[PDB]
Design a protein around this ligand. Structure first.
Ligand SMILES: CCCCCCCCCCCCCCCCCC(=O)OC[C@H](CO[C@@H]1O[C@H](CO[C@H]2O[C@H](CO)[C@H](O)[C@H](O)[C@H]2O)[C@H](O)[C@H](O)[C@H]1O)OC(=O)CCCCCCCCCCCCCCCCC
Ligand SMILES: CCCCCCCCCCCCCCCCCC(=O)OC[C@H](CO[C@@H]1O[C@H](CO[C@H]2O[C@H](CO)[C@H](O)[C@H](O)[C@H]2O)[C@H](O)[C@H](O)[C@H]1O)OC(=O)CCCCCCCCCCCCCCCCC
Ligand code: CLA
Ligand code: CLA
Ligand code: CLA
Ligand SMILES: CC(C)=CCC/C(C)=C/CC/C(C)=C/CC/C(C)=C/CC/C(C)=C/CC/C(C)=C/CC/C(C)=C/CC/C(C)=C/CC/C(C)=C/CC1=CC(=O)C(C)=C(C)C1=O
Ligand SMILES: CCCCCCCCCCCCCCCC(=O)OC[C@H](COP(=O)(O)OC[C@@H](O)CO)OC(=O)CCCCCCCCCCCCCCC
Ligand SMILES: CCCCCCCCCCCCCCCC(=O)OC[C@H](COP(=O)(O)OC[C@@H](O)CO)OC(=O)CCCCCCCCCCCCCCC
Ligand SMILES: CCCCCCCCCCCCCCCC(=O)OC[C@H](COP(=O)(O)OC[C@@H](O)CO)OC(=O)CCCCCCCCCCCCCCC
Ligand code: HEM
Ligand SMILES: CCCCCCCCCCCCO[C@@H]1O[C@H](CO)[C@@H](O[C@H]2O[C@H](CO)[C@@H](O)[C@H](O)[C@H]2O)[C@H](O)[C@H]1O
Ligand SMILES: CCCCCCCS[C@@H]1O[C@H](CO)[C@@H](O)[C@H](O)[C@H]1O
Ligand code: OEY
Ligand SMILES: [Ca+2]
Ligand SMILES: [Cl-]
Ligand SMILES: [Cl-]
Lengths: 202, 243, 30, 171, 56, 34, 37, 334, 137, 97, 34
């Protein structure tokens, strides 16, 4: 039982990461965008808007000195700017048409962004897996109005909880299995206390 | 024919394209034709910072630094007009592109030097009578260097130029004068100068590659301290096109 | 001096760990 | 709590910190003592559930203090050897903790806060590249104060126009 | 020495009053109202949409 | 940094005085007839 | 562990304490001007 | 006996002043590495660009920090959840600029502490004890995983892991409140009941046992000398203590079973802290505290504020001010 | 304070004609706005473009005017840029683009009128809160 | 002598009207018909020596010229301030709601 | 006056450390039997 509890713990942690990051076996069409996905989608959304307003997003310098919309990954790939710089490993069917061999392609960004992409990015940006325990969508500071907590949050959180308690269960039943097999799970034999037959530590 | 997944994580993304050593031909310029640079890439390989000596009469030198912000330094996807001038010289006028990178290098002893490595608003011309772009062709010109931080940037006490506190609020009754330079943010805008030496030419593809040396001021922390002089050396790539 | 002080107090604490553990009064059963 | 963070920087206060050490240390001792007693029990019954194997009137210790002592001496380096000291200590740590926390709050009654490190402020005021978690947290406090004050302190009739509200980029 | 009493006026010559710092506050914005507590000027954090700057 | 200049002597006595107290009691305890 | 037989008890009588303290204090009173400088 | 056999016998020896054991084989080097790197960095590491916006934060003593402000600063946002060992940096200077010491320390520490738990199991086995002390230790360990590993995974960057420093810890708590409203999360509330309660019961148990100590000493000596290490007799009258507490409340609110009582003393804080850890761990995937913002509304539709809305204002302060140069777009999505 | 007929009386068109909504209509409007619009327009702002909000004064200065029922219903059929120059059904929910914005498929004229009325009445309740964003929370 | 240039510019006509040479594009939402088409044309073809020069943007329809004429009273021009126009800040100046 | 800032602690430790040494020795001598 303890072996299987350890295994199930492991699998629960794994499933947590799976539903949280993967959008292949957990399609965002059904489960909603991943966290990375929605953050990226915001970057995309505002690039599209400002570029429509006439901004050159490739040369736009943000307040930090890093590009406001586009910057480089630690290995040089062109990636979205702002905090979503952390999420540059994200890949998804609505973003990949804008990706060239060196990452995000500036010409493709200027000329090739289809309306369906704007749509998808807006949708995913506005269904990020953020929300409250009573299912108020958005950041903790958002007012009541949108009834939404992403299925990815529900699945990830539930299964991290279960995986954790199942790890605990594995320690419990493993330790007990050892003690009982060795015959001291009910306690120490007063007339045969092992430590009393041991040389002192000092 | 490498794909994004071929390249990702390798460092190749921050490298400019190279031309084979067979690229030693000439790319003819038709003066009745207009041209563009469809892609200009600049990959810095060395960053040097001019030491600031004490006697102020010694020959100050440029000294090597250690790059600490990783393979995030190259300028790429730059495009612009390539004008055929009356005297046969070509002037490249930079329109747009990823034409800046924040860079921090470290000098011996640990002093960190941030700069906006850039060629923003580059205007660079060749010698007269460039009937063909060759390994003897070179571009020299000037660019702009805006503040390393733009107007919204807030320092660690929340002070800034277009936003933020305009005082040292933790020192409510200190005298203002001594802290003016730190309290009043300022936006530098200076010139830089650059040379591109063409080393290779594919006259058929309109491709040229070579080395470049550029020079510009570093970050002045929105006016709080003096910038350093930086010299940047590297390789460049450009694809010339009829427009 | 600040740093020297902080590092010194820390070092004293680590030394105290050493003595309290390896040079404790041994517990004895009666 | 949030008011005390934003206005008093209460977490910076060494008396609150002693409080925290007393409550968390208290909780730790609670846990470690209970667990240790439960895991050095003498087998005093035949049951696999070992709670009935204890008589409230019995004279003998229900767990082995000697085994507990060796166990922790080898696990952690030091161990209790004296039961009376153990239980006194269990009284001492949380009681002392709460008392220190009290002293700190008595300070906060007068706005006698541990709000700043003066050297920190002199350095940061002169040097706009000097940043620590200390100055970061003060920026947070400033946000808290300005954004919560008007509704939290309505008798003051605060009206802070938008343009004066401290905000970072975008947010 | 006392610098003397500061009286603030706007371009239209209305007297303006600085809102005093309550003891609770380590720092405090600079806000100027008229005698009816109506905001008339301030020192803006963000400038891009400032309406009440001393300059304006 | 511009620290309080009494900080050092304050910290120094804060440690040394009580520590010394304790050391004195300990050592005279050890020396008592076993 | 066998006890070390080379152990010897240590002593400082009250007169030596007074003499020693007088030495330390008088030295401090002498050198402190030079420490402050 | 062969060499490996002897080695195994030493490793698992019940006679080593500090028990080694197989878990200890992994524990000792990893914890030494984490410790040494942590001390050296805390003293002498240069500023770290925690949020990947070229705005390095100073954490070490030699670079302007004291004990309260100092920290080993989390690795750069640009790194994200990427593995950044020393040999991935072009230079130690780069490594340090980008916050490598942090990853080195928290990974060696997390491995090490996990092995510490396992080692508690191991020694309990070697001494013929019951095995579950380690289970109690699983609660603080899980907490540590929550703030050093899990939350970074959920938010997609070790730059949001808890800083190794005092003030940085406070930074982490305040930002966590801003974005997750953790105070209004029932698992954090169970955590508080866990530690407040554990403190309470610590004091209560301590004081009850102290109250019922059997007279064995004079007034001129410490009562502690009335207990002798290893004595078979219990050193206090639990009947007297039960009579006291039982009468303080009522009889059947009190424990007459020392085993039951000590089991309670283990279970309450351990379970509470388990819920605290699960709180951080699930707020890692942005399932946040209760949102009752604008929940009460009058007959026209005017918002009638509750204390929840004041909390919300405070949270807004923290939200807008935190990492003031890091956001370019209106929604802070991670 | 109550949700009175006067609160529920809003401009029908540009020519000065008003319409008075029932409380049922108000309820329907809040429900349908939450159903089809709140994901971006919670509180009267616009998450994917914060420069344009749903304040009546903003809607009034739109082209064509959107500060009345007809304007809002038309917008929900054929949305335009703020200047009216571009038709943006392809990136903005509408009956015209109910094929790519499927939540618009089960919306009837009655529904659109309800949503319009919600957008017009709510700022009469919340005031600056409506289109205010976090500052006014 | 140290000056916050932005504060200083708030004391010019910049603090009073839409500065065709400097102001962030979202300001054009203040008035009927200007955003986003004319606003993009205006910011793109900046700077202007006088306000009326905005009428000379190539390609303008007569309607557009009429709208601009109707709003010249709301426009000003001052010297290009680098701090306000670098970083693409005329298109996105880090301000949302 | 512009005195050496380390003078105070130099003097305080100069007094305290050997004085404490002597006191420890004395007190533990008194506590010995006989
Ligand atoms: C001393 C001992 C220790 C005590 C320490 C305390 C620890 C436990 C404390 C628990 C307190 C819970 C109070 C419940 C309050 C409540 O009324 O809760 C109310 C909420 C519902 O709130 C409503 O949620 C709504 C959500 O709105 C959203 O949804 C709406 C329609 O649903 C609309 O669409 C709206 O526009 C949209 O914004 C609105 O905010 C309403 O105003 C709001 O009242 O209940 C829900 O969320 C239902 C689901 C969540 C319930 C979770 C309960 C706790 C679970 C863990 C407990 C421990 C388990 C251990 C097991 C072993
Ligand atoms: C103090 C009192 C309690 C004392 C402690 C007792 C221990 C158990 C406590 C449970 C709570 C008691 C009340 C339960 C009522 C409730 O919950 O009511 C809530 C719902 C029913 O209410 C409905 O709740 C909905 C929640 O929104 C959901 O549906 C919405 C509308 O479609 C949206 O789609 C949204 O995205 C989606 O999340 C909507 O708000 C509806 O309007 C509303 O009617 O019951 C449900 O969901 C069923 C819940 C099933 C179990 C949840 C499994 C997943 C939990 C993951 C756990 C990991 C982390 C936990 C940390 C804590
Ligand atoms: C994998 C597990 C899992 C997940 C991820 C979900 C997720 C969801 N459920 Mg489902 N459901 C589940 C199991 C799950 N459920 C179970 C077991 C039942 C039978 C009770 C249901 C019956 C059900 C109904 C009837 C409904 C849902 C709904 C939902 C949705 C809204 C959730 C919500 O508001 O919860 C509220 C949050 C809580 C109640 C908090 C739970 C906290 C638990 C009790 C803590 C327990 C900790 C641990 C297990 C205890 C260990 C003790 C320790 C000492 C060892 C969400 C997508 C709703 C929906 O929208 O449907 C479309 C809905 O109406 N669920
Ligand atoms: C509270 C009880 C509870 C509930 C209600 C759930 C619910 C869920 N779990 Mg969780 N789980 C739990 C406890 C729970 N779990 C615990 C305690 C653990 C150990 C920690 C796990 C470990 C776990 C993992 C690792 C995963 C889940 C997953 C899931 C989801 C999918 C379940 C599934 O499809 O199984 C699968 C069904 C079976 C295994 C039974 C047989 C399936 C057959 C083979 C299907 C054949 C299909 C095929 C198409 C047929 C075609 C025929 C053809 C000829 C035409 C579901 C929401 C999955 C998930 O979504 O994670 C996010 C997942 O990956 N659970
Ligand atoms: C690591 C996390 C942590 C921990 C462990 C603590 C710990 C503590 N905090 Mg701190 N706090 C923290 C983080 C933390 N804090 C943070 C990040 C902040 C933001 C700055 C604060 C802000 C804060 C404030 C503002 C205060 C504390 C206080 C305290 C102390 C409260 C002790 C107590 O039990 O009072 C509980 C109350 C009592 C013990 C009084 C008597 C209670 C009676 C007996 C109740 C009787 C109940 C009755 C029988 C009926 C009940 C019925 C039921 C229905 C309710 C304790 C040391 C308090 C303090 O320092 O006080 C001196 C305090 O005022 N903290
Ligand atoms: C290089 C440099 C400079 C690095 C610096 C690094 C750095 C950041 C340092 C931080 C500085 C630091 C540590 C600051 C601490 C700040 C702080 C708040 C201090 C509080 C001090 C103070 C007096 C607080 C007042 C409240 C108070 C009294 C708290 C006491 C807390 C306390 C000591 C709790 C005890 C916890 C503990 C581990 C107990 C172990 C007990 C034990 C061995 C149990 C085992 C056991 C159990 C049994 O049941 C039985 C039967 C037996 C037999 C047995 O053995
Ligand atoms: C069966 C339910 C298990 C629930 C989760 C585990 C709870 C106990 C774990 C604490 C471990 C502490 C450290 C070791 C301490 C230790 O060593 O344990 C000692 C103690 C005594 O052990 P015994 O050997 O006598 O019995 C355990 C087995 O051997 C079975 O006989 O163990 C138990 O009492 C098990 C109790 C099971 C039932 C407990 C349920 C209590 C929680 C119920 C849920 C509360 C949720 C509230 C949320 C609002
Ligand atoms: C594998 C190695 C793992 C552990 C390595 C490190 C262990 C260090 C443990 C503490 C050693 C010092 C103990 C001195 C004190 C000492 O020697 O204790 C000795 C004492 C022994 O108790 P007894 O019951 O034997 O004493 C009975 C009578 O003598 C009473 O007078 O132990 C306790 O009192 C336990 C409760 C206090 C435990 C306090 C622990 C504090 C933890 C550290 C907190 C400060 C850290 C600051 C960091 C900067
Ligand atoms: C890393 C740095 C560590 C620093 C540790 C510092 C420890 C320094 C210990 C040095 C203190 C020694 C004090 C011994 C004090 C002391 O024990 O004196 C009495 C002692 C008598 O010795 P007996 O052989 O009688 O032994 C009796 C035993 O009880 C003593 O252990 O004579 C000496 O030790 C020889 C040196 C005498 C020198 C004393 C002359 C002082 C006269 C007054 C001078 C000032 C006034 C002058 C006026 C102009
Ligand atoms: C729901 C059906 C819905 C309504 C109703 C609605 C209305 C609406 C109006 C009236 C405007 C014009 C605002 C003004 O003139 O000031 C407007 C503008 C935008 N909206 Fe919208 N909108 C509804 C739904 C949605 C959804 C779901 C989104 C997000 C995906 C969205 C976004 C926007 C955007 C962007 C704009 C600005 C458009 C532009 O001028 O370029 N709306 N909405
Ligand atoms: C910060 C400044 C620090 C300065 C500190 C200086 C440290 C000084 C250490 C003094 C050491 C005293 O050493 C102490 O000597 C006495 C004898 O004198 C020993 O005492 C031993 O001998 C005596 C004989 O009279 C017996 O009565 C006693 O029972 C026995 O234990 C102690 O076991 C030992 O601990
Ligand atoms: C035994 C290891 C002690 C820690 C080593 C400290 C880093 S080395 C240290 O680095 C500084 C910044 O570059 C230099 O200014 C300084 O000269 C140099 O000694
Ligand atoms: O909180 Mn708010 O949210 Ca998690 O990212 Mn976005 O800002 Mn930032 O990098 Mn540390 O921190
Ligand atoms: Ca050449
Ligand atoms: Cl922060
Ligand atoms: Cl961002």
């Amino acid at each position: 039982l303890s072996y299987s509890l350890g295994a199930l713990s492991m699998m629960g942690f794994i499933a947590t990461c799976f539903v949280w990051f993967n959008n292949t076996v957990y399609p965002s069409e059904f489960y909603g965008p991943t966290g990375p996905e929605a953050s990226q989608a915001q970057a995309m959304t505002f690039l599209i808007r400002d570029q429509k307003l006439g901004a050159n997003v490739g040369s736009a310098q943000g307040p930090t000195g890093l590009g406001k919309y586009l910057m480089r990954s630690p290995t040089g790939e062109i990636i979205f700017g702002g905090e979503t710089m952390r999420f540059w490993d994200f890949r998804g069917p609505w973003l990949e048409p804008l990706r060239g061999p060196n990452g995000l392609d500036l010409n493709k960004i200027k000329n090739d962004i289809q309306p369906w992409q704007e749509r998808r990015a807006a949708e995913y940006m506005t269904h990020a897996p953020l929300g409250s325990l009573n299912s108020v969508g958005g950041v903790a500071t958002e007012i009541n109005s949108v009834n939404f907590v992403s299925p990815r949050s529900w699945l990830a959180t539930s299964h991290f909880v279960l995986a954790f308690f199942f790890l605990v269960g594995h320690l419990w039943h493993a330790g007990r299995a050892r003690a009982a097999a060795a015959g001291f799970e009910k306690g120490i034999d007063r007339e045969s206390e092992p430590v009393l037959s041991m040389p002192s530590l000092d | 024919t490498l794909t994004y997944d071929d390249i990702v994580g390798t460092g190749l993304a921050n490298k400019c394209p190279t031309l084979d050593d067979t690229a030693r031909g000439a790319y003819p310029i038709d003066s009745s034709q207009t041209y563009r640079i469809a892609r200009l890439c600049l990959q810095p390989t060395t960053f040097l910072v001019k030491e600031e000596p004490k006697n102020k009469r010694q020959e100050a030198e440029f000294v090597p630094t250690k790059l600490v912000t990783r393979e995030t330094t190259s300028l790429d996807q730059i495009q612009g007009e390539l004008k055929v001038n009356s005297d046969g010289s070509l002037t490249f006028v930079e329109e747009d592109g990823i034409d800046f990178q924040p860079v921090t290098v470290q000098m011996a002893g640990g002093e960190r030097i941030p700069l906006l490595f850039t060629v923003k608003n580059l205007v660079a011309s060749t010698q007269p009578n460039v009937t063909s772009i060759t390994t003897s062709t070179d571009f020299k010109g000037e660019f702009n260097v805006p503040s390393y931080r733009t107007a919204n940037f807030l320092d660690p006490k929340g002070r800034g130029l277009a936003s933020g506190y305009d005082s040292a609020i933790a020192l409510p009754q200190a005298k203002e004068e001594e802290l003016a330079r730190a309290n009043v943010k300022r936006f530098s805008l200076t010139k830089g100068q650059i040379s591109l030496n063409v080393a290779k030419v594919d006259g058929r593809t309109g491709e040229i590659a070579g080395t470049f040396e550029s020079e510009q001021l570093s970050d002045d922390d929105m006016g709080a301290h003096e910038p350093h002089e930086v010299k940047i050396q590297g390789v460049f790539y450009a694809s010339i096109e009829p427009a | 001096m600040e740093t020297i002080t902080y590092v010194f107090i820390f070092a004293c604490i680590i030394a105290l760990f050493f003595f309290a553990i390896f040079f404790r009064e041994p517990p004895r059963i009666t | 709590l949030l008011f005390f963070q934003g206005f008093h920087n209460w977490t910076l206060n060494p008396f609150h910190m002693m409080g925290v050490a007393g409550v968390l240390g208290g909780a730790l001792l609670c846990a470690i003592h209970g667990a240790t007693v439960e895991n050095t029990l003498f087998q005093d019954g035949e049951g696999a559930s070992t709670f009935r194997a204890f008589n409230p009137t019995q004279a003998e210790e229900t767990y082995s203090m000697v085994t507990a002592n060796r166990f922790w001496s080898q696990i952690f380096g030091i161990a209790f050897s004296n039961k009376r000291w153990l239980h006194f200590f269990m009284l001492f740590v949380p009681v002392t903790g709460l008392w220190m926390s009290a002293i700190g709050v008595v300070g906060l009654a007068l706005n006698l806060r541990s709000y700043d490190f003066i050297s920190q402020e002199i350095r940061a005021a002169e040097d706009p590249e000097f940043e620590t978690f200390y100055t970061k947290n003060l920026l947070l406090n400033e946000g808290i104060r300005a954004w919560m004050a008007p509704q939290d302190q309505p008798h003051e009739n605060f009206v802070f126009p938008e343009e004066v509200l401290p905000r970072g980029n975008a947010l | 020495a006392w610098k003397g009493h500061a009286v603030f006026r706007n371009k239209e010559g209305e007297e303006l009053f600085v809102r005093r710092m309550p003891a609770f506050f380590e720092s405090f914005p600079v806000i100027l109202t008229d005698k009816n507590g109506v905001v008339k000027a301030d020192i803006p954090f963000r400038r891009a949409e400032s309406k009440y700057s001393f300059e304006q | 940094m511009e620290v309080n200049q009494l900080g050092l002597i304050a910290t120094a006595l804060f440690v040394l005085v009580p520590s010394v107290f304790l050391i004195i009691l300990y050592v005279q305890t050890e020396s008592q007839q076993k | 562990m066998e006890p070390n037989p080379n152990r010897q008890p240590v002593e400082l009588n009250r007169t030596s304490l007074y003499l020693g303290l007088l030495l330390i204090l008088v030295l401090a009173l002498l050198f402190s001007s030079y420490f402050f400088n | 006996a062969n060499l490996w056999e002897r080695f195994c016998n030493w490793v698992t020896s019940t006679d080593n002043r500090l028990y080694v054991g197989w878990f200890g084989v992994i524990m000792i080097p990893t914890l030494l590495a984490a410790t040494i790197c942590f001390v050296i960095a805390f003293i002498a590491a240069p500023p770290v660009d925690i949020d990947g916006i070229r705005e390095p934060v100073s954490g070490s003593l030699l670079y302007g920090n004291n004990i309260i402000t100092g920290a080993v600063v989390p690795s750069s946002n640009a790194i994200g959840l990427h593995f950044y060992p020393i040999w991935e940096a072009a230079s130690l200077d780069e490594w340090l600029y980008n916050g490598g010491p942090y990853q080195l320390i928290i990974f060696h520490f997390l491995l090490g502490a996990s092995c510490y738990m396992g080692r508690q199991w191991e020694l309990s086995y070697r001494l013929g004890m019951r095995p579950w002390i380690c289970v109690a230790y699983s609660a603080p360990l899980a907490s540590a995983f929550a703030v050093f590993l899990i939350y970074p995974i959920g938010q997609g960057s070790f730059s949001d892991g808890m800083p190794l420093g005092i003030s940085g810890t406070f930074n982490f708590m305040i930002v966590f409140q801003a974005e997750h409203n953790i105070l209004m999360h029932p698992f954090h509330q169970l955590g508080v009941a866990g530690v407040f309660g554990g403190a309470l019961f610590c004091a209560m148990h301590g004081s009850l046992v102290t109250s019922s100590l059997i007279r064995e000493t004079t007034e001129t000596e410490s009562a502690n000398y009335g207990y002798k290490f290893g004595q078979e007799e219990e050193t206090y009258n639990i009947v007297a203590a039960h009579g006291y507490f039982g009468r303080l409340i009522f009889q059947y609110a009190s424990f007459n079973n020392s085993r039951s009582l000590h089991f309670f003393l283990a279970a309450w804080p351990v379970v509470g802290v388990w819920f605290a850890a699960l709180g951080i761990s699930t707020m890692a995937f942005n399932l946040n505290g209760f949102n009752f913002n604008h929940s009460v509304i009058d007959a026209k539709g005017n918002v009638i504020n509750t204390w929840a809305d004041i909390i919300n204002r405070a949270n807004l302060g923290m939200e807008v001010m935190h990492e003031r140069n890091a956001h370019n777009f209106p929604l802070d999505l991670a | 304070a109550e949700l009175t007929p006067e609160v529920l009386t809003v401009p029908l068109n540009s020519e000065g004609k008003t319409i008075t909504l029932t409380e049922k209509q108000y309820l329907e409007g809040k429900r349908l706005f939450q159903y089809a619009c709140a994901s971006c327009h919670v509180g009267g702002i616009t998450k994917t473009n914060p420069s344009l909000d749903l304040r009546t004064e903003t809607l009034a200065l739109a082209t064509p005017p959107r500060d009345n029922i007809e304007g809002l219903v038309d917008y929900m059929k054929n949305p335009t840029t703020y200047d009216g120059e571009q038709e943006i059904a392809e990136v903005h929910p509408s009956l015209r683009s109910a094929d790519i914005f499927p939540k618009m498929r089960n919306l009837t004229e009655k529904d659109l009128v309800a949503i319009a009325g919600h957008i017009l009445v709510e700022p009469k309740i919340l005031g600056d809160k409506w289109g205010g964003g976090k500052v006014y929370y | 002598e140290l000056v916050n240039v932005v504060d200083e510019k708030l004391g010019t006509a910049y603090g009073e009207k839409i500065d065709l040479n400097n102001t962030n594009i979202a300001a054009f939402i203040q008035y009927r018909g200007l955003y986003p088409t004319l606003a993009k044309l205006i910011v793109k073809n900046a700077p202007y020596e006088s306000v009326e020069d905005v009428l000379n943007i190539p390609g303008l329809t007569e309607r557009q010229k009429q709208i601009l004429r109707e709003n010249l009273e709301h426009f000003t021009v001052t010297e290009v301030e680098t701090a306000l126009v670098e970083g693409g800040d005329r298109y996105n100046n880090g301000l949302y709601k």
